[PDB]
């Protein structure tokens with residue numbers, strides 16, 4: 001498998017562009033930025049709102065827990081390569097505690113509202129609008145040779161008042177290289193694509209489109225998360241139960257993938273459940289035939305058959321968003 005678009009971005013660029021192991025960090029000055037309060041955490045960091053002491057601006061300060069040299073230069077390089085693209089988080093500075101050497105990444109401040117409280121108040125139009133904004137970022141980073149590989153609500157910050165959105169947390173992102181084989185322990189479980197669940201290692205950009213489809217399904221059907229498996233074998237069952245097992249078998253054989261004896265036994269046999277079987281009282285104001293057509297074109301086992309970010313921004317599901325813009 002090779003990507004149907006942008007396949008050659010890193011092939012034509014100077015090696016310094018993608019050879020992140022050759023980066024040397026220009027360290028800024030730790031004292032320019034003071035932590036004000038904690039706002040987030042994860043496996044690999046703590047995240048604080050802070051202040052720039054020179055100008056009195058807000059910022060966000062992301063302190064990293066101990067990380068390999070290699071891993072951390074990948075994140076920074078990708079962040080620098082993409083600074084200035086539409087809806088991509090802006091890295092402002094990189095700094096370190098002198099005594100302990102702990103690195104901190106400094107970012108623009110976004111004034112966010114948690115997805116779990118925000119989404120259930122979003123209108124049909126708002127849903128269209130923010131997915132579109134999110135699609136801008138996706139097309140941008142794919143156009144520059146990068147997969148994000150961790151799309152999900154927790155990683156998309158939104159200031160509902162300014163109607164702005166940024167894609168965050170580039171910790172798991174990689175450069176795309178034609179034919180390169182990749183680690184499948186990426187994305188978070190509810191947003192992992194079939195290719196990862198079955199060990200096809202030569203994935204591309206299209207993985208981020210499955211995750212988006214997951215995020216989308218969850219938003220229109222009011223069902224967080226949409227595919228709810230307890231572990232990686234359960235995640236694939238939970239997909240096969242909606243998409244049906246016929247599609248799976250064609251996928252496997254197309255790419256000649258032997259499934260695992262036990263997994264195959266878990267997955268079983270299941271027919272296709274139509275998208276409309278998920279509509280209910282709480283959700284029918286958000287589910288329309290354009291929403292479903294769009295969703296259907298994102299969630300395909302075959303990664304080569306999903307829409308590109310660039311083809312999705314033009315589906316008629318987003319027509320009114322496009323016309324607000326052109327004016």
Ligand SMILES: Ic1c(I)c(I)c2[nH]cnc2c1I
Pocket residue numbers: 039040041047060062107108109110111112157168169
């Ligand atoms: I809340 C929040 C905000 I606002 C930004 I910007 C982040 N960047 C990484 N994690 C972040 C979290 I948690």
